[PDB]
Swiss-Prot record, chains A, D:
Residue numbers of N6,N6-dimethyllysine PTMs: K42
Cellular component, GO annotation: extracellular exosome; extracellular region; membrane; nucleoplasm; nucleosome; nucleus; protein-containing complex
Residues bearing the modification N6,N6,N6-trimethyllysine: K19, K42
Taxonomic placement: Eukaryota, Metazoa, Chordata, Craniata, Vertebrata
Transmembrane intervals: none
Keywords: Acetylation, ADP-ribosylation, Chromosome, Citrullination, Disease variant, DNA-binding, Hydroxylation, Lipoprotein, Methylation, Nucleosome core, Nucleus, Phosphoprotein, Ubl conjugation
Full-protein interval shown: 39 to 136 of 136
Keyword Acetylation: yes
Name of the protein this chain belongs to: Histone H3.1
Protein function: Core component of nucleosome. Nucleosomes wrap and compact DNA into chromatin, limiting DNA accessibility to the cellular machineries which require DNA as a template. Histones thereby play a central role in transcription regulation, DNA repair, DNA replication and chromosomal stability. DNA accessibility is regulated via a complex set of post-translational modifications of histones, also called histone code, and nucleosome remodeling.
Gene Ontology molecular function terms on file: cadherin binding; DNA binding; protein heterodimerization activity; structural constituent of chromatin
Swiss-Prot record, chain B:
Principal localisation: nucleus
Any one annotated GO CC term: extracellular exosome
Modified residues annotated as N6-(2-hydroxyisobutyryl)lysine in this record: K21, K59, K60, K80, K103
The species this protein was found in: Homo sapiens
Family (UniProt): Belongs to the histone H2A family.
Post-translational modification: It is involved in the initiation of both imprinted and random X inactivation. Ubiquitinated H2A is enriched in inactive X chromosome chromatin. Ubiquitination of H2A functions downstream of methylation of 'Lys-27' of histone H3 (H3K27me). H2AK119Ub by RNF2/RING2 can also be induced by ultraviolet and may be involved in DNA repair. Glutamine methylation at Gln-89 (H2AQ104me) by FBL is specifically dedicated to polymerase I. It is present at 35S ribosomal DNA locus and impairs binding of the FACT complex.
Name of the molecule in the record: Histone H2A type 1-B/E
Gene name of this polypeptide: H2AC4
Shown part of the complete sequence: 17 to 119 of 130
Lineage: Eukaryota, Metazoa, Chordata, Craniata, Vertebrata
GO MF annotation, one: protein heterodimerization activity
One GO term of the biological process aspect: heterochromatin formation
Keywords: Acetylation, Chromosome, Citrullination, DNA-binding, Hydroxylation, Isopeptide bond, Methylation, Nucleosome core, Nucleus, Phosphoprotein, Ubl conjugation
Residues that bear N6-(beta-hydroxybutyryl)lysine: K21, K80, K103
Swiss-Prot record, chain E:
Gene: H4C1
Effect of R21L: In TEBIVANED4; results in early developmental defects when expressed in zebrafish embryos
Known disease link: Tessadori-Bicknell-Van Haaften neurodevelopmental syndrome 1: An autosomal dominant disorder with onset in infancy, characterized by poor overall growth, microcephaly, hypotonia, profound global developmental delay, impaired intellectual development, poor or absent speech, and characteristic dysmorphic facial features, including hypertelorism and abnormal nose. Other variable neurologic and systemic features may also occur. Tessadori-Bicknell-Van Haaften neurodevelopmental syndrome 2: An autosomal dominant disorder characterized by poor overall growth, microcephaly, hypotonia, profound global developmental delay, impaired intellectual development, absent speech, and characteristic dysmorphic facial features, including hypertelorism, abnormal nose, and wide mouth.
Modified residues (N6-methyllysine): K1
Protein's recorded name: Histone H4
Portion of the full sequence shown: 21 to 103 of 103
Length: 98, 103, 86, 98, 83
DNA sequence: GCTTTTTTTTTTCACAATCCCGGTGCCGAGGCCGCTCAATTGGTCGTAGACAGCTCTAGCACCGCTTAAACGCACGTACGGATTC
DNA sequence: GCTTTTTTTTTTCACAATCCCGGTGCCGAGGCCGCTCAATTGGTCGTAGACAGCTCTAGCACCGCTTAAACGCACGTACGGAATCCGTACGTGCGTTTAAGCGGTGCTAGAGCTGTCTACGACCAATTGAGCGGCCTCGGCACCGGGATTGTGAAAAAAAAAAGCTGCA
């Protein structure tokens, strides 16, 4: 029974997704999450579909790029597994977070 | 006077002129510079009230840049407003990362 | 008005999808503790971006958030976005 | 023969400088740098005194701030000593250099 | 020696003092040059803009405003010189 | 149990730094002076935008089948991290 | 300097994954059309700013003292990081469950457009005190020394906890 070495598929995924541009979050789950959060601020709101798409474009990009910063932060501490503290440093140096 | 009408020290007149002139819009409502004076006045007072405390807490009568820096950096909200601002002669908040302290 | 109150949709942002985003960021190995932490971050992004869009809406008196509402809001957060007007 | 252990004056010096507000770079050398660098964009330039001090408040401010972020990276790599790769990472993450 | 690389006028002692005020304890030797590099890029960027202001205003004297306006553009807003 | 080492802990002494007294003198905050222009005013005119009414876009709900993806568990390797030096 | 294994390297096939083509089909890039409203023409009038001339501000050069800071060197402690070692968190793959997505269907809130009318804000001329710069004063605050007090640590001394050896039962 054939079995790929841990990392060899992660590395493939890494190349698969860098080559592409389609959105990586499931479009309805995300849409439900937009609407849920928006209630906090105002009820019985409609969203243009383009406004929701504009939000999932702006989100995915923000995280995808935070994950870059975060990966350097893992590697800086001679690791390969990104950990919570990695994100938190990335965000503290970005100044998103006290 | 207008500032007197609005309950304000800040000059509702002067403010109104800076808006027409200052390339913000073609026309300026009669409310805007009243409101705008009030908000500038509010924020001014919160810093001075906090920095005037920092002076007295250092037995000093005159407020200095350090007193403002201390007032401002210790107030979660004022810090965020002035997060990308530098106060000349403010200095920085005493703080030493824990893993550096002895034992 | 014909049923609209929302559930708990943050778990909709599945571990598969967070893993795919990390993949696009060139991340090879991911700790157990990332996925929940990521949702916190994502939530706080969205809360901030929608608050501001929702403001721009409430000002123009609309009950419909436009793409421009979201665009104007994103430029405000220093996250300028291209290809939805403006 | 009294001898304080490594790092124990450091901490004194930290406590000391964090308590104070006074420029830490010598003012004349700084100024001679500001004119050296100004030449490369225009010759026979004069400066207001306060222009140089505006430049020097701004510089130290940036440097101090960068050192905080540098320290944080160095502590993130389970280290106590800042090194260039700390500065360079904190600048990579600030979006200052690619 | 002692000749016309004014950047070196930025002494180790002064670089040490900054990183102190920035809560730094133990300082690698390589750092005082890295710092020197970084400081220059900082000034280059700010001064280029400040003098770009100067040349536009048709003057030979760099004002403190010119710097203030430059520092705003670089996102390093500075209070207490004419803001 | 014993003795014999490292390690850990406690106790004692040295030294900066702070705060309390005593002081002096410099320099700029503060406030008054004397002039000036920018704020105020009532008048006149034009159109911005409130409003109300009308159109019809597009946003929201609902369904049922298809199948791609998420899900959860078994399995073991290479990673993280502790320790040493 | 060996003899005996582990460690690292090599070579040989099996297998999955990705790659590249032509074929096929759908739809949106591209473009033509006809009508509109915004860019252009040609005119007028008023003032923003270019320009010359003069004022005096503050930037520069220089010099000669007095330190405080930079400097260079001796010395060693605590640090960075290399090397080892061990447990399991993570990746890979499977069978099972889920609901996203799809395309269609039916309803209407509300986005957005129109026309109407007036409340309001820009414009003006006349007046005038609020706030400007200039300048004088007087006490806050920097800096002084003496000595007590309190953090802040380093060393040296005591205690304890491991390291190694035992002397019977
Ligand atoms: Ca006294
Ligand atoms: Ca075509
Ligand atoms: Ca199963
Ligand atoms: Ca209209
Ligand atoms: Ca009206
Ligand atoms: Ca005055
Ligand atoms: Ca006084
Ligand atoms: Cl108004
Ligand atoms: K503008």
């Amino acid at each position: 029974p054939h079995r790929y070495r841990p990392g060899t598929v992660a590395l493939r995924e890494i190349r698969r997704y860098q080559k592409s541009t389609e959105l990586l979050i499931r479009k309805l789950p995300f849409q439900r999450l937009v609407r849920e959060i928006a209630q906090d601020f105002k009820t019985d709101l409609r969203f243009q579909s383009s406004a929701v798409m504009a939000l999932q474009e702006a989100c995915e990009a923000y995280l995808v790029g935070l994950f870059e910063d975060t990966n350097l932060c893992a590697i800086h501490a001679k690791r390969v597994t990104i950990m919570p503290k990695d994100i938190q440093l990335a965000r503290r140096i970005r100044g998103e977070r006290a | 006077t207008r500032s007197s009408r609005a309950g304000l020290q800040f000059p509702v007149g002067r403010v109104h002129r800076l808006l027409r002139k200052g390339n913000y819009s073609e026309r300026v409502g009669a409310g805007a510079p009243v409101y705008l004076a009030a908000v500038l006045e509010y924020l001014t007072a919160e810093i001075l009230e906090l920095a005037g405390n920092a002076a007295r807490d250092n037995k000093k009568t005159r407020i200095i840049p350090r007193h403002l820096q201390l007032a401002i950096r210790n107030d979660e909200e004022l810090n965020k407003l002035l997060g990308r601002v530098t106060i000349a002669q403010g200095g920085v908040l005493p703080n030493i990362q824990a893993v550096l302290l002895p034992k | 008005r014909h049923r609209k109150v929302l559930r708990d949709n943050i778990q909709g942002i599945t571990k598969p999808a967070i893993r795919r985003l990390a993949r696009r960021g060139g991340v090879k190995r991911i700790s157990g503790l990332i996925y929940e932490e990521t949702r916190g971050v994502l939530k706080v992004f969205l809360e901030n971006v929608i608050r501001d869009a929702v403001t721009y809406t409430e000002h123009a008196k609309r009950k419909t958030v436009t793409a421009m509402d979201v665009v104007y809001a994103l430029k405000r957060q220093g996250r300028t976005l291209y290809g939805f007007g403006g």
